[PDB]
């Protein structure tokens, strides 16, 4: 009567160890998939830094991103925070951003673009600009790192079905 | 999150460096090479926190708490056995046995070292008394037998000395008859003749024999019995023949 209980205890322990290994295998596979996604996101951010490092080719993409942020803000006066080399490009393309924003929206164009004194660096974002309301009511991050991180949640199903289908 | 992992890695490296200062335990330091490698190099805390947050270093709070509990139990067992010294292979065998245990925080090995450290901690701040002297000699014999036998092998003397130390510690300050009767009964039932030579001081055996001769001396009424009891209380060894001769004379 005691030996049957001891054999039942050992039979419970082996079934615990087999489930522990059976969980460790799927934990290792999930760690490998998370490492592959963590490498793909690092490659996308590394390409986004070098793509954001060129203001001549990034000027129309930054103007289209500023028009995309102006199409969601819906305000005639907003503060645009960007890098030290992006304020001069937006200052010389504010009329083109207003003319391009006027042709893509039914509302009137912006009156003026407030160039803030906060200059972002390359150690915090991968490029882009931050468009916020002038009344202190909403903040919209339109950077490359925030756009890739927020777009990765919706692009994760096509990447998962295309990579591990 | 990362500050507890960096502080646990620094405390694990400090406990690992304080455990073996001679570099003679390659088995204990071999398993902690992944955490001691980042602590043995001069680096900033921001680099260790950024490396731990990016998946480039150990960041498991459960595994670091279990390994820090096992290393804290081995360092607490090695530090609790002073001034005696344990064997080099016994520390690696106790570390290998504690590493292969399913639950080191729920077993009796941690409670035995916690009670052994609590007995010396309570006896260090306490004044010199007979129960503190008997509990100090039982804690010294339990420290010598615990250092000689480890914490991975069961023993009746360690459980009886721990139960007698817990029962003597749980008693009040008006129970000297039960502490003297428990010390005389536990000392009379020991297999060895005197467990105080080379482990206790020379004045402690004469203080214990003078305490037992002074305790048994107030019950006598003859001059020959008081002369023999006063003459037998000048020995520097606590043997069972002195207690049997003192009990036969009374």
């Amino acid at each position: 009567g005691n030996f049957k209980s001891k054999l039942k205890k050992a039979m419970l322990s082996q079934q615990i160890t087999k489930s522990t290994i059976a969980n460790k295998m799927r934990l290792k596979v999930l760690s490998a998939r998370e490492q592959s996604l963590d490498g793909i996101f690092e490659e996308t951010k590394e390409k986004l830094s070098g793509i954001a490092n060129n203001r001549d080719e990034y000027k129309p993409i930054l103007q289209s991103l500023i028009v995309e942020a102006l199409l969601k803000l819906l305000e005639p006066k907003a503060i645009v925070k960007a890098l030290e080399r992006d304020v001069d490009l937006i200052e010389s393309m504010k009329d083109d951003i207003m003319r391009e924003y006027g042709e893509k929206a039914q509302r009137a164009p912006l009156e003026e673009i407030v160039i803030s004194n906060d200059y972002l660096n390359k150690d915090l974002v991968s490029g882009g600009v931050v468009v916020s309301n002038a009344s202190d009511k909403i903040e919209i991050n339109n950077t490359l790192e925030e756009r890739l991180k927020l777009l990765s949640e919706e692009a994760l199903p096509a990447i998962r079905l295309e990579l591990y289908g | 999150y990362h500050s507890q992992v960096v502080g646990k890695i620094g405390y694990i490296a400090r406990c690992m460096q304080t455990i073996d200062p001679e570099n003679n335990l390659k088995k204990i330091r071999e398993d902690y090479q992944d955490v001691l490698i980042w602590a043995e190099k001069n680096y900033r805390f921001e680099e260790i926190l950024e490396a731990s947050k990016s998946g480039k270093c150990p960041n498991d709070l459960d595994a670091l708490s279990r390994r820090s509990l096992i290393l804290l139990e081995l360092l607490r067992l090695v530090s609790s056995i002073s001034p005696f010294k344990m064997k080099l292979d016994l520390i690696e065998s106790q570390y290998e046995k504690m590493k292969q245990h399913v639950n080191l925080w729920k077993s009796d090995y941690h409670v035995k070292l916690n009670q052994l450290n609590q007995l010396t901690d309570y006896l260090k701040n306490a004044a010199p008394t007979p129960k503190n002297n008997f509990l100090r000699a039982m804690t010294s014999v339990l420290q010598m037998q615990i250092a000689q036998y480890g914490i991975t092998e069961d023993n009746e003397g360690i459980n009886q000395l721990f139960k007698l130390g817990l029962h003597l510690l749980a008693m009040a300050n008006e129970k000297i008859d039960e502490q003297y009767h428990l010390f005389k009964g536990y000392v009379k039932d020991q297999p060895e003749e005197s467990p105080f030579e080379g482990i206790l001081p020379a004045e402690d055996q004469k203080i214990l024999v003078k305490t037992m001769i002074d305790y048994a001396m107030p019950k006598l009424s003859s001059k020959v019995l008081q002369d023999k009891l006063s003459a037998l209380s000048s020995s520097d060894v606590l043997t069972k023949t002195l207690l049997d001769s003192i009990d036969r004379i009374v």
Partner: protein, 49 residues
């Protein structure tokens, strides 16, 4: 009871060796089409949406 004393610790070696072949086929397919998803992620990140 001797079989339940040597199995502790071997669950990680037996679980790591069981998923060793899956990590090479998953790493080869993940490393093969890395540019096709990085170019689509950079193209979608560089375009307004």
């Amino acid at each position: 009871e001797q079989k339940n004393a040597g199995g502790v610790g071997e669950l990680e070696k037996k679980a790591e060796a069981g998923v060793q072949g899956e990590l090479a086929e998953i790493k080869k397919i993940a490393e093969k089409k890395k540019d096709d998803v990085v170019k689509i992620l950079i193209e979608t990140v560089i375009k307004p949406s």
